[PDB]
Structure 1
């Protein structure tokens, strides 16, 4: 379990993992290891992700959160991801977005970087049942 009260929190992921990041911000600069890129800019209203959109990333407009934001990405294959994020919106309503992409990026070895979580967010990184302590350290 890697947690940083600074601003960024990195942690290598291993097959069959689960990333539960509870942060209170409108921006999240994510860097999934080195074989994937994903920038969640809720400030403008779009989540740029490079999974399998061919050639490069794909910009998909997202709701306008309002403070708290729960991002839960469960891994369970070569690159299969399940981005299930539930957060509060400016529309005074709950926003539960989901993404299911089998062919995304890596899995076994992938140091994901989460910047913008500020000092108060927790990064729950566990391989289903076991705990991947940096799975490299």
Structure 2
């Protein structure tokens, strides 16, 4: 395992691979070296993400995280990326969430920068998942 234990880290994403980050944050912001950027607004309880240089971030509501979060990033074409966020909930539970971008407009194997990891941050590189399904 790649144990970061810092404020930021950077991984190499690849089409066919995933990047998992076990970090503890309350507002982590990451950007991918091609086209991807997001802000895990854990505190406010919402997950904002954009695809491109200047773009609007969509929100996926978060069920009040406590800090512990796993952010996973996998590309399976070039622009088609999937982001998994797994957060420990303050409500005596866990909550996990994700989003996918059918065409982020990127090319295979981009450098993903995870920043705001806080502390306890640890990265693990994986290979892409299984079984396609999305709208575009």
After TM superposition, is the score higher than 0.5?
A: yes
Q: Which range moved further: 52-61 or 87-96?
A: 52-61
CA distance in 2, matches of 1:118, 1:104: 27
TM-score by length of 2: 0.76
Q: Is the 8 A contact 1:52 1:103 kept in 2?
A: no
Give the unaligned 5+ runs of structure 1.
Answer: none
Q: CA deviation at 1:30?
A: 0.6
Q: CA deviation at 1:26?
A: 1.4
Hey, what does 1:15 align to over in structure 2?
15
Q: CA deviation at 1:120?
A: 2.3
Q: Which range moved further: 98-107 or 27-36?
A: 98-107
Q: CA deviation at 1:31?
A: 0.9
Give the unaligned 5+ runs of structure 2.
Answer: none
Q: Is the 8 A contact 1:40 1:47 kept in 2?
A: yes
Return the structure number with greater strand share.
2
CA distance in 1, matches of 2:55, 2:116: 27
Hey, what does 1:96 align to over in structure 2?
96
Q: CA deviation at 1:40?
A: 1.2
Q: Cα 1:120–1:101, aligned 2, differ >3 Å: closer, same or farther?
A: same
TM-score by length of 1: 0.75
Q: CA deviation at 1:100?
A: 2.9
Give the secondary-structure state (helix, strand or coil) at the position aligned to 2:77: coil
Q: Cα 1:53–1:111, aligned 2, differ >3 Å: closer, same or farther?
A: closer
The superposition leaves residues 111-130 of structure 1 with CA deviations (integer Å, 9 ceiling, x where unpaired) of 21111213421112345599
Aligned residues: 136
Q: Cα 1:96–1:22, aligned 2, differ >3 Å: closer, same or farther?
A: same
Hey, what does 1:132 align to over in structure 2?
132
